[PDB]
Design a protein around this motif. Structure first.
Motif, PDB file in Angstrom:
ATOM      1  N   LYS A  36      48.641  38.893  39.360  1.00 15.98           N
ATOM      2  CA  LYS A  36      47.506  39.913  39.341  1.00 15.98           C
ATOM      3  C   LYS A  36      46.884  39.657  37.829  1.00 15.98           C
ATOM      4  O   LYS A  36      45.742  39.436  37.865  1.00 15.98           O
ATOM      5  CB  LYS A  36      47.923  41.251  39.521  1.00 15.98           C
ATOM      6  N   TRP A  59      46.421  41.066  46.135  1.00 14.74           N
ATOM      7  CA  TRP A  59      45.601  41.852  45.423  1.00 14.74           C
ATOM      8  C   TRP A  59      43.919  41.897  45.674  1.00 14.74           C
ATOM      9  O   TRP A  59      43.519  40.764  46.173  1.00 14.74           O
ATOM     10  CB  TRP A  59      45.876  42.005  44.207  1.00 14.74           C
ATOM     11  N   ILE A  60      43.216  42.787  45.610  1.00 12.65           N
ATOM     12  CA  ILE A  60      41.712  42.932  45.476  1.00 12.65           C
ATOM     13  C   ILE A  60      41.342  41.820  44.443  1.00 12.65           C
ATOM     14  O   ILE A  60      41.643  42.143  43.367  1.00 12.65           O
ATOM     15  CB  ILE A  60      41.132  44.048  45.258  1.00 12.65           C
ATOM     16  N   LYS A  63      35.193  41.839  41.451  1.00 16.01           N
ATOM     17  CA  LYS A  63      33.770  41.262  41.763  1.00 16.01           C
ATOM     18  C   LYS A  63      33.230  40.323  40.688  1.00 16.01           C
ATOM     19  O   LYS A  63      32.710  39.240  41.069  1.00 16.01           O
ATOM     20  CB  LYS A  63      33.012  42.525  41.715  1.00 16.01           C
ATOM     21  N   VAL A 106      34.665  34.125  49.692  1.00 15.91           N
ATOM     22  CA  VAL A 106      34.637  35.710  49.308  1.00 15.91           C
ATOM     23  C   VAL A 106      33.326  35.985  48.857  1.00 15.91           C
ATOM     24  O   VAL A 106      32.702  35.793  48.234  1.00 15.91           O
ATOM     25  CB  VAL A 106      35.909  35.776  48.159  1.00 15.91           C
ATOM     26  N   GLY A 108      33.022  40.030  48.777  1.00 21.55           N
ATOM     27  CA  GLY A 108      33.368  41.567  48.590  1.00 21.55           C
ATOM     28  C   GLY A 108      33.371  42.308  49.898  1.00 21.55           C
ATOM     29  O   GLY A 108      33.736  43.466  49.595  1.00 21.55           O
ATOM     30  N   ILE A 110      34.962  42.784  53.704  1.00 24.73           N
ATOM     31  CA  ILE A 110      36.520  42.814  54.401  1.00 24.73           C
ATOM     32  C   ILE A 110      36.314  41.400  55.300  1.00 24.73           C
ATOM     33  O   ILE A 110      36.047  41.665  56.324  1.00 24.73           O
ATOM     34  CB  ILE A 110      36.944  43.853  55.037  1.00 24.73           C
ATOM     35  N   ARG A 165      45.483  47.103  57.923  1.00 23.20           N
ATOM     36  CA  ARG A 165      46.635  46.743  56.841  1.00 23.20           C
ATOM     37  C   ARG A 165      47.863  47.499  57.577  1.00 23.20           C
ATOM     38  O   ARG A 165      47.666  48.885  57.983  1.00 23.20           O
ATOM     39  CB  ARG A 165      46.437  47.104  55.562  1.00 23.20           C
TER      40      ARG A 165
END
Length: 227
Positions: A36, A59-60, A63, A106, A108, A110, A165
């Motif tokens: 991460k 992990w997220i 942005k 990607v 931002g 889901i 999840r």
């Protein structure tokens, strides 16, 4: 000549990324990121990647990264069906035996991103076996095609479904499950880093793995763990 990042976790993905980096020294400068903390805007900007590829990432994604670099996630559903988390367990719960791996940009949301393209994936075996099967498709077929053809990704079309999840507590097997559903639960949670399928017996937890179906029974390994 082209700078890329492969950001991934799980032993098989890391191995496959190291192999990919070595085999393609002439075409790509490949940076492998596994933690991460290594994936920050300040560190990534210095690498100046053309693509950031995520075979599996926990992990997220910040942005400042997905808005400034082309980030490619590999999501194992036939999108817009099955947007969201724990896709393998969500697919196997639904009795699905074949899915698609979607390479997406990607954005931002889901799993709402534009789709580069898809490949078929069979869902028999343990989680580990299925993730390694997927990883092999991603590394041997999808990544080479993406970097070579550089296709323009296309907006998702059609009705969406959203997966949630799964939590560790949802590993608990109910006594009302039929035998094949028990088998599915054990196999779908049998992989590196995943909370094994379990039952409670007083203060004990019984965690199962390496299930094999026989006539009228499942043979498995069990850990009888004291509370």
């Amino acid at each position: 000549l082209m700078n890329i990042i492969i950001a991934t976790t799980k032993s098989w993905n890391i191995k496959n990324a190291q192999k990919f980096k070595k085999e393609n020294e002439s075409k790509y400068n490949t940076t492998i990121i596994t933690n991460k903390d290594e994936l920050t805007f300040e560190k990534v900007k210095l690498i100046n990647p053309e693509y950031i590829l995520f075979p599996h990432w926990s992990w997220i994604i910040p942005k400042e990264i997905f808005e400034n670099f082309t980030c490619v996630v590999f999501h194992m559903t036939d999108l817009p069906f099955g947007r969201g988390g724990s896709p393998l367990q969500n697919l196997i719960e639904r009795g699905i035996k074949k899915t698609k791996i979607s390479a997406i940009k990607v954005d931002g949301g889901i799993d709402t991103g534009d789709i580069f393209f898809k490949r078929d994936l069979d869902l028999y075996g343990t989680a580990e076996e299925i993730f390694m099967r997927a990883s092999k498709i991603i590394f041997n077929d999808m990544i080479p095609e993406l970097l070579t053809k550089r296709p323009v990704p296309q907006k998702q079309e059609g009705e969406a479904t959203v997966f949630q999840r799964r939590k560790p507590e949802q590993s608990e097997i109910s006594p009302d499950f039929d035998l094949e559903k028990i088998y599915d639960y054990i196999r779908m949670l049998d992989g590196e880093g995943y909370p094994r399928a379990f039952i409670k017996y007083g203060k004990y937890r019984l965690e199962f793995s390496r299930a094999s179906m026989k006539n009228g029974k499942i043979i498995a390994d069990v850990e009888i763990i004291e509370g």
